[PDB]
Amino acid sequence: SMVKSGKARAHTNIALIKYWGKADETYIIPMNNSLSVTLDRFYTETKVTFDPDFTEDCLILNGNEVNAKEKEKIQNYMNIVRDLAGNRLHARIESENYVPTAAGLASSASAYAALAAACNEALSLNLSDTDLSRLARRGSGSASRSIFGGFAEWEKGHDDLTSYAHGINSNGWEKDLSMIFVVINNQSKKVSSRSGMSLTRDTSRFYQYWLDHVDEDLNEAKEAVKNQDFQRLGEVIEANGLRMHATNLGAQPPFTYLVQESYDAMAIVEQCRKANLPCYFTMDAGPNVKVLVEKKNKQAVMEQFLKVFDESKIIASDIISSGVEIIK
């Protein structure tokens, strides 16, 4: 009778125009806008239960305790929630990732968007989509975008109030598109995108080059979406993604997320283009290659990869039209 709960499902998203580097490390304010598509196949379901008897926040992930470290980090995030709601209630958070994390797919975007929405629901905060995006953003930058379906854009702003995402209307175009995930063999050594982007943003000799072109890329991609022009969107996003990886090469000292196998998959995309199967690739904080393709060519493109790659390593998802949702 004194316990408040809410549960939400939020889907992962992949940046076509990259978020890479922060203006503000504390509040997670980015150096540039980003543009993403939200994936139907992969998502996180998160329940939060607030109870006055709880003395601290507890996080249960895929049925298992998290270590004292994750627990510490989740408690700090929930302080933001408590401050926002004006209460001192602690919560038990029970989360399930339905994201291929072992295969290298990121879950922080769906995780924080799900948590943000679940809290809004549990506490009856009535946050707008803008304020939900802002709350999610404090947990993970890319989470700001997972509040939304289809195409979404993160507006960088200049502070906590002005940095947030919104959904882009594409006249239903997202329903015609898909993404193929090529799972690429990589080392299982620890990697962090927050840490990588910070080293690059602070020291990279090629970071200015990234900054000088990103707005142009973004405008070009947005214009391509307004026109449902697949080739035009693809060319700029593929180039934007490669420029992002270029910046890491200029870091002090340099680094890369790509491995030879990543390059083999890229070669396959170009082969597909020359054989009249339009598609374009992007890569994130890892070697996995993501292939944007029109839904009607999804299978034809997949068969080309399935010549080279194990069946288990080629995973396609549609792009979902709806945004974060409240569930049982």
Ligand X SMILES: O=C(O)[C@@H]1CCCN1C(=O)COP(=O)(O)OP(=O)(O)O
Give the DSSP letter string of 212-267. Answer: HHHHHHHHHHHHHHHTT-HHHHHHHHHHHHHHHHHHHHTSSS---S--HHHHHHHH
The least CB distance from residue 229 to ligand X, in Å, is 23
285 binds, among ligand X, a copy of itself, none (CB under 5 to 8 A by kind): ligand X
The DSSP letter of residue 66 is P
The least CB distance from residue 258 to a copy of itself, in Å, is 7
Work out whether 188 is an interface residue with a copy of itself (CB under 8 A).
Answer: no
Work out whether 238 is an interface residue with ligand X (CB under 6 A).
Answer: no
Distance CA 120, CA 85 (A): 9
What are 81's two structure tokens? 């929630």
Among the listed residues 191, 259, 277, 308, the single contact to a copy of itself using CB under 8 A? 259
Which of these ranges, 75-83, 145-153, 245-253, 295-303, lies near a copy of itself under the rule CB under 8 A?
245-253
Distance CA 261, CA 264 (A): 5
The torsion angles phi and psi of 224, rounded to 5 degrees, stand at: -70, -35
Distance CA 258, CA 52 (A): 48
Place of tokens 């690429």: 184
Work out whether 28 is an interface residue with ligand X (CB under 6 A).
Answer: yes
Q: Which is nearer to a copy of itself, 215 or 270 (CB)?
A: 270
Work out whether 278 is an interface residue with a copy of itself (CB under 8 A).
Answer: no
Work out whether 181 is an interface residue with ligand X (CB under 6 A).
Answer: no
The least CB distance from residue 233 to ligand X, in Å, is 17
Give me the residues that bind a copy of itself (CB under 8 A), please.
186-187, 205-206, 209, 239, 242-243, 245-246, 249-250, 252-256, 258-260, 263, 266-267, 269-270
